[PDB]
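Input (Peptidoglycan D,D-transpeptidase FtsI):
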Amino acid sequence: RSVRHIAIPAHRGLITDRNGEPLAVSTPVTTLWANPKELMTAKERWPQLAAALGQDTKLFADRIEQNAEREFIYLVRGLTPEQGEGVIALKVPGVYSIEEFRRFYPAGEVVAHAVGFTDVDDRGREGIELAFDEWLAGVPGKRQVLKDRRGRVIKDVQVTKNAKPGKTLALSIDLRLQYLAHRELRNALLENGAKAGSLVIMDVKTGEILAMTNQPTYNPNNRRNLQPAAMRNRAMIDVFEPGSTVKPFSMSAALASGRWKPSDIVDVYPGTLQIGRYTIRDVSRNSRQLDLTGILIKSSNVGISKIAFDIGAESIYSVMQQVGLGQDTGLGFPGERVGNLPNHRKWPKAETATLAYGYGLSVTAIQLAHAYAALANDGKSVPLSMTRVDRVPDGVQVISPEVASTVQGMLQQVVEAQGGVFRAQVPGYHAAGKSGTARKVSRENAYRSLFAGFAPATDPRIAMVVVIDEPSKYFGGLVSAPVFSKVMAGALRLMNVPPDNLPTA
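Output:
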């Protein structure tokens, strides 16, 4: 007698990793709904129905009696096809089913922050699911069904508009590398008794983000009792002052200025330098004079500041801006933070020095990895991508290949030379990188352990950033280096990259 114009869900598009491994799959579920006007005519059936739904007898009865005037209530949503058909087989008057779609995340917490999740209505709410919701969602259809005066659906009349399925999306993530990264970062936090962390791996030639993992994390298939801290995609929303990890870009500015050469010597004695009301301090007051490579190895704040006064902060600012520090990544990720790299018309001495040793700016882990990928790719910046790319993108030469090559060699000495971060070495390969201690001024002042590098030195393929938040187990400045080593070793092997430092493995 009556007529209703309901909808037909679209099969939400599959999300895969770059090799086609499934990251988010739309699966069939059965939702049960009732017409209370019909249920009210079969009350002797309610206890059996209530038990099949895992509901208390009297509470289920109360719920039906409270809604007896309606023609529609939900009984349960998202049952497997088998469960739904099993309740339908009870032949309870007024109980109906509809088949919907529901996401399943086969890798669970391993890639939770990148992929995000959907609504109970299959709508993208976080991460890629949100950002690409238009691509993934498709277009629903339109169905028609007739009803009586009691609201009883008599017959499905026809189908009006055919649903249109969403489109497949292949991410840049390599799930083999994501597992390695997720496993090693997690083990690292437990061993150092750390709070949170991030690890980013990217292809320096294509800009593809091959892994992006954070701790803590969560299972998107089971979001009960979910803590807000666990949902933060720290690689893109946690901002910090990168500290010594951007001294290599101060150096690039120096070697590009025409005024400095690697063999130059800077006097750092006595490990401090006064500028007005401020005092610059070196951790290693062991040294009196350092060459340019030694300044990075010892992480001399005094040394890099003296270079900065000579070349000027503008030259340093320009390199840091051009490699993407505190600049929009273009990834358009939900909640992504851009940081801050403030310019000045005139640079005072203090602001000059603090920029040079990495406290005059705020960045994300993704930006820091992008910047190291520019240095690794022989000075050529390529845009970041969260999706698989089919051609090497056009890059921008932001650092001359000669300077990039020199600084590459210095960072390789940072890892390999005496007194350097030896725990960063990758067996079988020549790796290069730089360690640092981050700072997020807030009222608070959090300290993070950072390592950023790339490999292999002969033809760099991937860049990596490891962030470990305030390790409690407190010489923690070199806590991230061993994570870089293990993950870089596993990544190079998984990507079939030929070793260039035998004998080591």
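The CA atoms of residues 426 and 485 lie 5 Å apart.
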